[PDB]
Structures are given as C-alpha cells and as structure tokens.
C-alpha cells in the first residue's frame, strides 16, 4: 500500500489548488467522490469511514478529492449567483483532465481503467463520468444518488438541497430545468451510453415517506430502463433496511471491493 498523502493539485480551469487525499497501491484507482455537504478540509469518505483502511493492499489506489460543496462535480455555467462565489466550478474538467494528468506524471497512476464511486449528489456524477468517459471509468457506483435529476420533482428538490447546502444556485450550474444541460447530466437519460459502453454499474439505495416513494419510483424505473435497454453489467441493491448514511454507504463500498478488483484488475 502507501501512507495516506495530502496533495495540492492545481486546477487551471478553477484558478486554484484542489486538495486531494491519496493512497497508492496500484496503477488503477477508485475515485471516492463526496456528498452534497462536501467540506474543504477532508473528504467525507475519510471523515466518516475506514475507506482507506479497507482498500489497503487491494491492488488499487484511492483518490479522495476535497471540496466542491453542492457542485455535483460538474462544470458550472457560471459562479453561483447567490452566495458570492468568486469563481466557476469546473469539477468535471478537473476530474477528467487535470487531476489524472497530474497523477500520471507524478505517480504513474493510469488515467484509464478506474472506478468512479459517488454518493448523494455525486452518485449520479459517477454514472455520468462513466457515460461520457468510458475509458477513464469502466466502473461506476451510485450510492443514494439522484438517478433522474432532470425529471419531475427532482430539479426542485436538488435546487432546494443546494440552497440548503451553502446557499448554492442550481440555476448557475445547469440553467433552468428546461436547459439541455439537465438532460446531458441525467443518468436515466444516458442509460444507452452506459449500455453501449458496457459499463459496470453498482447502484445502491435504501417529508420522508413521500421522499422514499419518489426514490423508489426513480430507482426502480432506472433498473427497469437499464434492463429494457440491454443492460447486462449492473448490480442493483435496494435492501429495505438500508439507510441514506455513511455506515451503509461504506457497507456498499466494502461489498463492491471484490467487484472492482475483478473488473479493473482482471
């Protein structure tokens, strides 16, 4: 393995340095993306789980970016017009070009053959990353993600969640919900890409009752649509007693370990 390192990785596009938590152990890597309330000091996976301990000696490096609260790890249209953001979020640019090039040049981490693992806001992001960058991400996991952001109740619920996580503006990110950027970044809409790429996908989920019914309809509709579209490379875990929380999110990270090992490492 490797002692956990704390890296400063420059982002030309965002005009600043992005902190990155890193643990070596192999040329391919698991990207652990954070949730809606991503803090600026440490990645949620490291604050809350033994994710590093669990992938030590796995044959895989672990990459744990820091920051990007309410960013959906996407390239925003503009700075958030609401909370005085003085720059434009460009996290997709960062994760698909700037971080991997840094990591290949300085550490020999391969820019292809990796896994994207996301939760909450980045669950969908991990699927979108694999949909448009299949060489970089043959494996993607969404744990309690927004599988259908562009549809029905979700744009409002996302906008309200961002409002409540740092005062961010979904309008600055992807425009109003009629904007095509909403459907470009909708995992449900991009299922044919996941099917065409033969991406290995791992999907978990487990007022409040209304909210559960919304996620249940959305996630079952996702599963249904993936299978109807020819998907053969998915795992869908909807345990009744699973929760929307770090211990179950970690339980899923552990359960897919062997899965990621076989896919990325043959």
């Amino acid at each position: 393995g490797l002692p956990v390192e704390y890296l400063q990785v420059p982002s030309a596009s965002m005009g600043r340095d992005i902190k990155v938590q890193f643990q070596g152990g192999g040329p391919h890597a698991v990207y652990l993306l954070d949730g809606l309330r991503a803090q600026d000091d440490y990645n949620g996976w490291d604050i809350n789980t033994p994710a590093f301990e669990e992938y030590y000696q796995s044959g895989l490096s672990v990459i744990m970016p820091v920051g990007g609260q309410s960013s959906f790890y996407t390239d925003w249209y503009q700075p958030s017009q609401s909370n005085g953001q003085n720059y434009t979020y460009k996290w997709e640019t960062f994760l698909t070009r700037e971080m991997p090039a840094w990591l290949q040049a300085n550490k020999g981490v391969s820019p292809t053959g990796n896994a994207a693992v996301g939760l909450s806001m980045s669950g969908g992001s991990a699927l979108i990353l694999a949909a448009y960058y299949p060489q970089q991400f043959p494996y993607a996991a969404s744990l309690s993600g927004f599988l259908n952001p562009s549809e029905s109740w979700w744009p409002t619920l996302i906008g309200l969640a961002m409002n409540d996580s740092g005062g961010y503006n979904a309008n600055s990110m992807w425009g109003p919900s009629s904007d095509p950027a909403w459907k470009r970044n909708d995992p449900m809409v991009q299922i044919p890409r996941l099917v065409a790429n033969n991406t290995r996908i791992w999907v978990y989920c487990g007022p409040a009752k209304f909210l559960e019914g919304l996620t249940l309809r959305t996630n079952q509709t996702f599963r249904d649509t993936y299978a109807a579209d020819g998907g053969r490379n998915g795992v869908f875990n909807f345990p009744p007693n699973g929760t929307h929380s770090w211990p179950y999110w970690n339980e899923q990270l552990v359960a897919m370990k062997a899965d990621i090992q076989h896919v990325l490492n043959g």
Side-chain angles (χ1 to χ4, degrees), residues 117-136:
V117 171
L119 62 133
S120 171
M121 76 159 171
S122 67
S125 315
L127 293 169
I128 300 295
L129 283 172
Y132 298 95
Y133 305 86
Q135 290 208 269
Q136 180 170 13

Side-chain angles (χ1 to χ4, degrees), residues 172-190:
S172 310
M173 194 177 52
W174 292 338
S177 50
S178 55
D179 195 284
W182 276 92
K183 258 149 209 304
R184 185 264 185 192
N185 295 296
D186 189 309
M188 181 94 69
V189 175
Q190 301 322 314

Side-chain angles (χ1 to χ4, degrees), residues 140-151 153-176:
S142 171
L143 322 173
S144 304
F146 306 89
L147 299 174
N148 204 1
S150 62
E151 208 79 78
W153 268 73
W154 291 120
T156 299
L157 291 178
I158 285 152
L160 282 172
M162 283 167 63
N163 191 284
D164 273 280
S165 186
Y168 283 87
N169 184 359
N171 221 277
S172 310
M173 194 177 52
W174 292 338

Side-chain angles (χ1 to χ4, degrees), residues 3-151 153-251:
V4 178
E5 310 181 12
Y6 203 84
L7 310 177
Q8 296 293 334
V9 179
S11 168
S13 53
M14 307 203 236
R16 49 161 72 200
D17 295 327
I18 309 295
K19 325 305 154 250
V20 171
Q21 292 181 275
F22 178 87
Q23 176 181 278
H28 299 288
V30 179
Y31 294 31
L32 290 182
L33 315 181
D34 200 347
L36 194 70
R37 276 144 147 73
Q39 285 181 1
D40 273 333
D41 58 340
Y42 304 97
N43 184 293
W45 283 101
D46 190 49
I47 301 186
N48 286 109
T49 79
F52 280 130
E53 196 32 68
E54 286 164 338
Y55 278 71
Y56 173 58
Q57 306 182 324
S58 72
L60 300 157
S61 307
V62 183
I63 306 158
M64 253 197 227
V66 183
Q69 165 182 42
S70 298
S71 74
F72 281 74
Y73 290 98
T74 203
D75 283 0
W76 282 44
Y77 275 121
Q78 65 184 3
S80 195
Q81 305 294 112
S82 48
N83 53 8
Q85 199 179 25
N86 67 5
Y87 69 106
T88 299
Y89 271 146
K90 314 301 285 184
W91 271 91
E92 185 181 312
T93 299
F94 181 67
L95 295 171
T96 57
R97 313 266 164 250
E98 294 173 339
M99 211 190 53
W102 198 93
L103 290 168
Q104 184 181 25
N106 290 295
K107 293 190 168 282
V109 163
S110 170
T112 63
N114 301 311
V117 171
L119 62 133
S120 171
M121 76 159 171
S122 67
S125 315
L127 293 169
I128 300 295
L129 283 172
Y132 298 95
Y133 305 86
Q135 290 208 269
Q136 180 170 13
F137 299 111
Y139 196 105
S142 171
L143 322 173
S144 304
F146 306 89
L147 299 174
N148 204 1
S150 62
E151 208 79 78
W153 268 73
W154 291 120
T156 299
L157 291 178
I158 285 152
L160 282 172
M162 283 167 63
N163 191 284
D164 273 280
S165 186
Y168 283 87
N169 184 359
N171 221 277
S172 310
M173 194 177 52
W174 292 338
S177 50
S178 55
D179 195 284
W182 276 92
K183 258 149 209 304
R184 185 264 185 192
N185 295 296
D186 189 309
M188 181 94 69
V189 175
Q190 301 322 314
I191 276 169
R193 299 194 184 268
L194 299 164
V195 169
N197 301 324
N198 197 36
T199 316
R200 178 58 165 183
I201 68 166
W202 179 294
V203 179
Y204 163 86
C205 211
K209 169 254 208 63
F210 179 82
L211 203 138
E212 205 245 23
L214 271 188
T215 325
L216 177 54
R217 306 139 202 178
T218 291
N219 297 351
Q220 297 295 352
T221 303
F222 189 96
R223 208 248 309 129
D224 291 339
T225 313
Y226 175 74
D229 283 1
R232 299 169 127 280
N233 217 2
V235 175
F236 298 83
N237 292 346
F238 311 112
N241 276 17
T243 50
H244 294 87
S245 64
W246 288 102
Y248 237 107
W249 295 332
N250 172 258
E251 186 280 325

